[PDB]
């Protein structure tokens, strides 16, 4: 991150623009036997399974596109959006970076018990650590 | 970068190839952690108006969700970290970036997202 | 009662009997007070301009209302308070909320209700 | 704590809306031998009389409704609103989270004394200390 | 704990003997305003429903009997048994000791895995803290 | 009422409700600790008239009926106490009263009773 | 507290005045389902019962009256008379504010036996350990 | 209550009056927190393997179903905890027993149940 | 004055007679020293930015028209202020407000005046 | 300081003797354009009025006589007595020693409230600070 | 200053408006032997002369009217406005706050000593110290 | 008084002119106020609390009513005292009398009033 | 990761995907590093007679089939190890799990294999 | 001029002649650096991370790109400065600006540039 | 420092206004034996030259104007504008002031080496390391 700085940044939000870019749940990846992770997580209290499939270049390692789905709770859409903005245009040493902590205090309220609609980073931690296994790089997995 | 090259003495043939940010010197990472985190964390009528600067601690200050305070472990090991959202994290570096030792995860540009998700919710 | 999740408990099994709030953990109830203020003090250009949040000190900044600096008293006891018109107070944790040893009050919303009264007048 | 989040939230003031929604000076409570307090207070000198009667559920221990009466001073109406917004819809932990200096330094210009223009903290504390003795729980009463 | 002392302890528990003492879930109680708590919990992802209803002598402050139901999971049967065993013949404060991580990590096995196959504690914390609410004391609850 | 002053409230005909007993709280029940060592005793016809105040160690002197010794505990917990017939205790405030936090028996009104029961036996 | 102030309170004994006000084993209370305590203790050494039943207002939380009884031991009469001076006209946070060690070394004169002449405070720790349970708040009891 | 009585009850006037629990004031809580770890601790053909007793530390040991390790908090406050699934806790005595700053839980009888729940499976 | 009363100056026969004001008195000069000092710090696109209290070090910041940072006097006295236009300034309250221990000028509203005299020109 | 010497200074209270010497409300003062204050207190619920008029010599600056009145409650008589004992025989500087706290711990019985007979400090600070504006010396005023 | 809060001080100051509202070149004062001061300060070459006169009530001691004039520099009109806000509503002690350095380095801009356009504070320090000799209160003047 | 000639003066030509009380300051303050509180002391049935001077700092007994334990403030200032209702103050001299720095009130002979109004009510 | 979730990452739409073995940190070393240094110590007449940890340290105490003592090294390094047949290592965590910085080995399962290979022979 | 005179050199007859003044030298002006960036701080829409003063020692930084922490060199010299793009170096006064001991550069007006060039790009 | 006060001064581009003031590549200077520097630096990445030439008074030592040429990158032009804001209207101790690390991390995202665009300050360091010598004073250079 770097100060450009946009002063109209706050008024808008990247998440809508990111959603707009791909019609519809389409991404970009390279094809070889080492292949992209496929990731989902289900919270029964959220009532939906959030599907975060990374589509990653295999010759630069850079995540070109990672798409999300969300259903049920309307509070988990925002969480999944911010788990695709952050890791796009980043490597897998900057997408193995991401923490659950990011979205684990944004629907706060008191997060005495971790809300289900903050489990949208587990969707992509079942994709990028299911990437490390299928890409043939696990150790950061463990 | 060790090379101390981020060339113009190249036609940028070198640049095309995958190349990842690395912080040198030991003051460089300060302007990559608090460059990104504080960028929308001061004065606007949309939320969040100020950040504090202190001696021996330098973190984001946002009174919207609480904060992370970077601490220091007694002489034997350098840096410590703690959070009431994920316990005593413990801290060092490994790529010249801020690398928490819970799982080797960075937090260089993660907490950036919670400044612009303070508007959203 | 400690877990790591909310959900997979009471899925409308019982819903006619609610239950009083949990308080996990000790320093999470210093994050709840912070959280309230950012849409009860800021995101508008009218009145109150800032509520400073500092490292290892939590402050409340209101122009003529007065300021509350949360202090610590000499090691033996933790957290000290001094109000600009109410006199000295002290707080010790109960079940993980910070509860005054005065009237049993909690500063979770004492220093949140002055803040949105600033906006009114 | 709390969020909405909206930039127009502080444009309006919550207190007038809250007072308006409820119609008028009637709450919900359970009926049993332990019973809800009453919060008479009066100052004939400054002319302000109030009455903050809590109406609290005795089977959940959650303040459902509490309303104020404000006579005399016209600037004490909006200082009796913090003893009918924090308390309403919240627990008996939020019964005591107020000060008399919370609402008595604002008109001020802090003097040596204070002012008895608003006595609304005192009013609800004549009712929650009458609901720690009628409720039958004197642990935090004194 | 208590120095009984059993030096002949192997792999048996008297928890089964305790539960039977009175057939589930009925026990004995006093009748007046502190009406005993009713506690339920369910898992939609493990299928276990546990119903813990304490029955308390109101005038001595000591739980006479509590028994459990267990459906779904067979490993949640053991979890409920200890919670009921402990708190009979004991004070309400002695039933506020118990932690959910008493039964949560005492199932299986690394901190990585956690299940909804043990929610027994939650159900008796919807009966001992739903009792406190009806007992008109909130100062042991919070 | 954390103001600890609240004049022009309840002139005593609009009360008919419980009245809160003072909280200051740092020295409120050091005026309830003794309440008959300036209101009673000292040059009275009965025994034990001696009184001593150090700089925070003040107790009634009643050796026969047993004295308490106010002490401070090593930094981690505040105040230390010693009782001849029940061993050492650890004390902190609860609402302003000076009590062990393991029980509800204060020494606050115990010394009030024992100076005027020293007349009897 | 409130004082003349004069040492005339030490010229006459307070216990006599206390006994005079409402003899014997009669008081004033609020009649409702959570009822006032019953305070008894017994020693078979001198075959005597000390009865310190508290009769307590259940809507202000103040002990209106407690009247002692003492049999056998003639030095235990004075012992039970200071468990009635303090607690009357004061809160239930001031009812429990006295130890048995307060009265169990006032005939000392260090001996070998503290006798059954100083058991009085265990008769009002049988009254508040029966009243706080009935009152329905055993928070300060245990 | 620091009655310090060694009986002088049972003639059946106080044996029809309930007697709950009388405070330690420091001793009892430590006990029973190790009296199922000194009665099922080891030395049986089946039971938990061992609990190692330590000086100035106290633990429960179970092979992998986790335990609560008791520690101390730096001077200002006392007690500190770490566990495999309950995260960091602290505690204060304020309900007559050791009160967790998570939700008020007392660990005196939790360890008792975990020992024989590690005998279950 | 140590009137320390809630109201009881308002029955209107002493509301037309003079009495002390703004002497409550140990936190009063951090409420009337910060009265509109930090009020003009944000929530305008004009005015003057960043004027704020730090950790309890109150400062005056103005673009290039003066500076006041509170300082301490050499040992045997405390609290010092300095002006580049009159050099050494000595301070401590004397009978009320701040009063120089150099002469008898007061910085109580000097800081506030200069914030908005940097908007005038 | 004080010498006679006897211990009968507490046997008979100072206040009666002070009142007796020079009653009331007359005093002695010099005449010039600078003139003495007049102090009052109000409240009709309490009923109190305490008319504290200093009469101050302008050739020594010493308050020769300041006499009180009391209306309303009989406990404000005593309060104003020691506000007419300490202030006489001294200048205006040492007639401003007085603290409300002097007389506000003597009708206590500590409350969180304040009485209308804890106002005798303010009664004479409506006279001596009305003689620091009419004496044209506002140095001691603030 | 005060809490309002006013962030609309944007090229606006109500000080000029306040001077306009009250007269100029007289104010409110009482006729008695203590009498109001008169202030002057001037530089002949610069041609700037500011006549700040306090007209102070001699029975309350509060400056209710503060006159200002400005001649010569037009950048000194602004300087005089700060000697006509703070001083009002206060006594001499709370109107002796201001320093020459308060306004002098707010004129300009370069290091150490500035110009001589401002003289505003000096003008009213020849007026309040001529009302500490004519008011008859030496101690403040030194 | 730096004349120090009290006795050789006052024979009716300066005894009809006002003369201020002598000040040393410290010797005089100890000579006067400490034994003005001892004149009240024991040998009467009108009760008393006694006078104390624990470490050369006045620590006058106020057991039943109020708390006015006088202490010395840490280096760079003298005398720390705290009123139970109007808050703390710092005491320094101004004319040989001890006059507060935060409100300009004395305590030179107020303590004498306190003791003998604690037996009037 | 940095988690705070262990529940609702298991209903089998993410546990049909590999659910990785996490290592972290103050929640996975306390008893999962002490999973055989007390498991096969006692509660059986068979096995190996002992492996026991120290008080405030952990040690492997297999009778003469090697040993490990966790050691510390002067400040600049925290924690150290030694192995009989290869000299001293150095031990530090970096991903939660302890890892030699002399060659890369984790003693998580070194002290598990050896324990039951000593039952074998 | 080193006599601190810059008045009476301004009526124009010597103001036209070359003279240079901007010297602080330290004690003694902070308007040329600390709060030269206060104007360029936050109130207005442009994003700036910090200018805010710390605990009373100037540690001026732009956490965006220009971290140049103002520090003191260890005793035997004064002033130390950090740089993100060329590492730390020792610095000392030469004319009351903080001057590079490498060949002389002054960060006095440079950091002023950087703040308003951090919103331009 | 800088005082106007206008904080919307840098909301709009400074550089445009600065460029607009002096049309076009003509400055003001004096000439004697000391004579203005000449300063260029290549950047064949852009394929052009950035020529920063100070035009300096040789009788006051104040840079009257500095005139610059920039081609290629559109961000290079705005890196040669802050080396012409600060230095103008100030001395050659402000031409020796400027750092090459000022403009070399503004585009970035702090690098470790200057980019082609950044090299603007290298052309004014080829203009002050040639002017200092010609001016006959290499003292300030080193």
Cα-Cα-Cα-Cα torsion C77, C78, C83, C84, nearest 10 degrees, comes to: 100
Chains that touch B (3 or more CB pairs under 8 A): A, C, D, H, I, M, N, O
Chain M meets chain E (3+ C-beta pairs below 8 A): yes
Which residues of chain G does D36 touch, with a Cβ-Cβ cutoff of 8 Å? none
Nearby residues of F20 by Cβ (< 8 Å), 6 or more positions away: C103, D125, D129, D141, D142, F1, J111, J112, J113
Dihedral sign computed on CA atoms, order L20, L25, L28, L32: positive
DSSP string, B9-47: SS-STTTTS-------SSSTTHHHHHHHHSSSSSS-TTS
Chain A meets chain C (3+ C-beta pairs below 8 A): yes
Interface of K with I in 28-47 (CB under 8 A): none
Q: Is J112's Cβ below 8 Å from some Cβ in F?
A: yes
Nearby residues of M99 by Cβ (< 8 Å), 6 or more positions away: M91, M92, M93, M105, M106
- C8 with E45: Cβ contact below 8 A: yes
Burial of L11 (0-12, 13-18, 19+ CB in 10 A): exposed
Q: Could you say which of C44, C97, C110 has the minimum Cβ distance to residue D11? A: C44
- A116 with M8: Cβ contact below 8 A: yes
Which two structure tokens, joined as six digits, stand for O32?
């004697």
Which residues of chain M does C8 touch, with a Cβ-Cβ cutoff of 8 Å? 7-8
| K10 min Cα distance to partner chain C (Å) | 13
Burial of F73 (0-12, 13-18, 19+ CB in 10 A): middle
Which residues of chain O does A2 touch, with a Cβ-Cβ cutoff of 8 Å? 108-109
Q: Is J125's Cβ below 8 Å from some Cβ in I?
A: yes
**B60 and B111 in contact (C-beta within 8 Å)?**
yes
Chain J interface test: which of F2, F3, F5, F20 (most J C-beta within 10 Å): F5
Which residues of chain G does E137 touch, with a Cβ-Cβ cutoff of 8 Å? 136-139
The CA-CA-CA angle for residues G28, G32, G36, to 5°, reads: 50
Q: Which alpha helices (H) appear in chain N, and where do they start and end? A: 110-115
Which two structure tokens, joined as six digits, stand for O139?
């003292």
Q: Could you say which of I47, I97, I109 has the minimum Cβ distance to residue K9? A: I47
Q: In N18-88, at which residue ranges do the beta strands (DSSP E only) sit? A: 70-71, 80-81
Cite the active site residues of J.
46, 116
Q: Could you say which of C85, C88, C105 has the minimum Cβ distance to residue F26? A: C88
> What 3-state DSSP class applies to M118?
helix
Which residues of chain D does A75 touch, with a Cβ-Cβ cutoff of 8 Å? none
First to last CA, chain I: 40
Residue L93 has phi, psi (to 5 degrees) of: -100, 170
Q: Which alpha helices (H) appear in J1-142, and where do they start and end? A: 14-21, 76-81, 120-124
Q: How far is it, in rounded angstroms, from Cα L84 to Cα J102? A: 11
- J126 with I14: Cβ contact below 8 A: yes
First to last CA, chain L: 38
Q: Across the D/E interface, how many CB contacts are shorter than 8 Å?
A: 33
Burial of C72 (0-12, 13-18, 19+ CB in 10 A): middle
Which two structure tokens, joined as six digits, stand for K83?
């000697």
Chains that touch E (3 or more CB pairs under 8 A): C, D, G, H, M
Other C-beta atoms lying within 10 Å of the C-beta of residue H16: 9
Q: Which technique? A: cryo-EM
* β-bridge mates for residue H81, sequence order: H70, H89
Q: Is N77's Cβ below 8 Å from some Cβ in I?
A: no
Q: Is N44's Cβ below 8 Å from some Cβ in K?
A: no
- I42 with B49: Cβ contact below 8 A: yes
Chain I meets chain L (3+ C-beta pairs below 8 A): yes
- M8 with A39: Cβ contact below 8 A: no
Q: How far is it, in rounded angstroms, from Cα D123 to Cα F6? A: 11
- K7 with C47: Cβ contact below 8 A: yes
Q: How far is it, in rounded angstroms, from Cα K23 to Cα M45? A: 106
CA distances from E11 to E14, H118, H120 (A): 10, 10, 8
Other C-beta atoms lying within 10 Å of the C-beta of residue A28: 11
Cα-Cα-Cα-Cα torsion N94, N95, N96, N101, nearest 10 degrees, comes to: -30
Chain C meets chain I (3+ C-beta pairs below 8 A): yes
- M14 with A40: Cβ contact below 8 A: yes
- H5 with G100: Cβ contact below 8 A: yes
Q: Which of G15, A107, E13, I3 has its CA nearest to residue B64? A: A107
Q: Which of A13, I119, I67 has its CA nearest to residue O8? A: I119
The CA-CA-CA angle for residues C70, C73, C78, to 5°, reads: 80
Q: Is A105's Cβ below 8 Å from some Cβ in C?
A: yes
**C72 and C2 in contact (C-beta within 8 Å)?**
no
| F98 min Cα distance to partner chain L (Å) | 15
Burial of A75 (0-12, 13-18, 19+ CB in 10 A): middle
Interrupted after residues, chain H (C–N over 2.5 Å): none
Task: Pick the residue from chain H with its C-alpha nearest to E5.
Answer: H39
Chains that touch M (3 or more CB pairs under 8 A): A, B, C, E, H
Q: How far is it, in rounded angstroms, from Cα B71 to Cα N43? A: 30
Q: How far is it, in rounded angstroms, from Cα K125 to Cα K129? A: 6
- N65 with B38: Cβ contact below 8 A: no
Q: How far is it, in rounded angstroms, from Cα G100 to Cα G109? A: 17
> What 3-state DSSP class applies to D41?
strand
Which two structure tokens, joined as six digits, stand for N106?
């002054």
Nearby residues of K17 by Cβ (< 8 Å), 6 or more positions away: none
Burial B27-64 (b: 16+ CB within 10 A, else e): bbbbbbbbbbbbbbbbbbbbbbbbbbbbeeebbbbbbb
- D116 with F20: Cβ contact below 8 A: no
Task: Pick the residue from chain I with its C-alpha nearest to K111.
Answer: I84
Which residues of chain O does I47 touch, with a Cβ-Cβ cutoff of 8 Å? 7
- D132 with G32: Cβ contact below 8 A: no
> What 3-state DSSP class applies to D67?
strand
| C4 min Cα distance to partner chain A (Å) | 6
- M13 with A49: Cβ contact below 8 A: yes
**J119 and J83 in contact (C-beta within 8 Å)?**
no
- D112 with I8: Cβ contact below 8 A: no
Q: Which of C75, C74, C68 has its CA nearest to residue C53? A: C68
Q: In chain O, at which residue ranges do the beta strands (DSSP E only) sit? A: 40-41, 50-56, 63-69
Q: How far is it, in rounded angstroms, from Cα O94 to Cα O82? A: 12
Residue with tokens 């036997």: A33
SS (H, E, C) C25-80: CCCHHHCHHHHHHCCCCCCCCCCCCCCCECCCCEEECCCCCCCEEEECCCCCCCCE
- D137 with E139: Cβ contact below 8 A: yes
> What 3-state DSSP class applies to G66?
strand
Q: Is D100's Cβ below 8 Å from some Cβ in C?
A: yes
| C58 min Cα distance to partner chain I (Å) | 8
Q: Could you say which of I44, I97, I109 has the minimum Cβ distance to residue K86? A: I109
| H7 min Cα distance to partner chain B (Å) | 47
**M26 and B88 in contact (C-beta within 8 Å)?**
yes
Question: Which stretch of DSSP H or E encloses residue A111?
Answer: none
Give catalytic status of residue O73 as yes or no.
no
Task: Pick the residue from chain E with its C-alpha nearest to D62.
Answer: E133
Q: How far is it, in rounded angstroms, from Cα C22 to Cα C95? A: 9
- C83 with I34: Cβ contact below 8 A: no
Radius of gyration of chain A (CA): 15
């Amino acid at each position: 991150g770097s100060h450009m700085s946009s002063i109209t940044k706050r008024l808008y939000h990247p998440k809508v623009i990111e959603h707009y870019t791909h019609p519809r749940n389409v991404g970009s990846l390279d094809k070889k036997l080492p292949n992209v992770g496929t990731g989902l997580v289900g919270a029964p209290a959220c009532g939906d399974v959030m599907r975060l499939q990374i589509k990653v270049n295999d010759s630069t390692g850079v995540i070109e596109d990672v798409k999300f789905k969300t259903f049920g709770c309307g509070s988990a859409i925002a969480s999944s959006s911010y788990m695709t903005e952050l890791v796009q245009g980043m490597t897998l040493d900057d997408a193995a970076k991401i923490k659950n902590t990011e979205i684990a205090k944004e629907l706060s309220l008191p997060p005495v018990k971790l809300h289900c609609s903050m489990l949208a980073e587990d969707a992509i931690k079942a994709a990028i650590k299911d990437y490390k296994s299928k890409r043939n790089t696990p150790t950061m997995l463990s | 970068v060790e090379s101390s090259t981020d060339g113009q003495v190249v036609p940028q043939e070198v640049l095309n190839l995958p190349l990842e940010k690395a912080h040198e010197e030991a003051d460089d990472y300060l302007d990559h952690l608090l460059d990104s985190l504080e960028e929308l964390s001061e004065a606007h009528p949309d939320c969040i108006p100020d950040v504090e600067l202190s001696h021996g601690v330098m973190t984001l200050e946002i009174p919207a969700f609480g904060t992370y305070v970077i601490n220091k472990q007694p002489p034997n090991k350098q840096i410590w970290l703690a959070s009431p959202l994920s316990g005593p994290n413990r801290f060092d570096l490994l790529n010249g970036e801020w690398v928490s030792l819970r799982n080797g995860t960075k937090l260089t540009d993660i907490l950036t997202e919670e400044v612009e998700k303070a508007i959203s919710k």
